[PDB]
Amino acid sequence: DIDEDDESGHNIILNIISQLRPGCDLTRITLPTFILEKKSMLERVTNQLQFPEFLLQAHSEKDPLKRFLYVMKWYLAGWHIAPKAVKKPLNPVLGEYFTAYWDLPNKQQAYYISEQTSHHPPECAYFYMIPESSIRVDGVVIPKSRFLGNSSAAMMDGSTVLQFLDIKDGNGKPEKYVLTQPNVYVRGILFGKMRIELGDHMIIKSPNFQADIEFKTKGYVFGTYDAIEGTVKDYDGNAYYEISGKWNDVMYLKDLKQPRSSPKVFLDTHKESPLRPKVRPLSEQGEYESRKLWKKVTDALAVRNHPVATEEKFQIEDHQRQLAKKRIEDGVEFHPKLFRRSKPGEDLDYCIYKNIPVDEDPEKQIRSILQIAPILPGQQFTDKFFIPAFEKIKSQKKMI
């Protein structure tokens, strides 16, 4: 039964590992389908966006340090929404895209648009906005796979930029937060049992505050799994708060100006109610839209038919290898449909192609967002959807 399946899975992974040297990447290694969850990475990102109420709280908070704490709460809250066993999202194909929306309790909507912008090396970009609350998020996920011996990792080199568009600094520009991502490990692959862990550092930086949060691994005897430890500081070396606890249990905040005080509950992940994204029905989705593209694989995963899931996934990835060969033959390269290459020196590799002026009427911002790609039920693709973003911005100003 399951014990015999576990032994064969063990054998399959050992035979892959036996040929590798610690320190190498895994870009050329195909992993088996029985470590896959039923969503692509483009959708997995939205797990981290399932607690918008904390972001709405931050936006309404006038004190910069308190506002920073709510942003940290928003960002830390999503990590525990993750598969239970040892599973990873599907690696998206080049040009795959995924859109979603939320119906928020305040009668507003949040919108999400994402695209896989590169395959070698893998990269996806995402855009998230709540126009009627003047909240905008732009980000990139850049996973660099690594074999380390008894462990493997996705070294997470992406980042997220959050802006409160109507909270202006001295320069009149929106208040900006940059947030990085901890690395995702699987440990115990050689002499143990596989377990997923977060590790290394998460950095959160605002105009006047910063936090460095270390995601720790357990010791042999001391410590616990899934522990976090960090400090909220200004940029002059003053420490204001200490964060502690576990990112998938209870996180605590200690006021460092009150030495005798004890850490208070900051985030109890077992008492939070996530808000899940909504998506257009499958009948309206495009060929390379995430849920539609992977539907045959995820259907086979859902019935535990791993021969079929493996064959369906190979067909998709083989087709992509053929498309890449055709690009070389035509002497062209891929360019994303929905994201334009950022200017040099900026935090992000890609940004959504559409110009959305920071202070225009949020109804006009919503209309611009909905023109980018079908998000809401009933919206249809236009012919222009499929042309590259760089060709779309050329016309977005050629008419001007």
């Binding site: 305040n106 009668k107 009627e132 929905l338 909905l370 980018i372």
Partner: peptide, 27 residues
């Protein structure tokens, strides 16, 4: 340049009452 067609009315918190009941259900 638009990649998608627009709803006949752009949805906002301000026209929510046109799209939902006073009991909160769709119409």
């Amino acid at each position: 340049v638009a990649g998608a067609t627009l709803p006949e009315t752009i949805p906002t918190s301000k026209n929510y009452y046109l799209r939902f009941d006073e009991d909160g259900k769709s119409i």
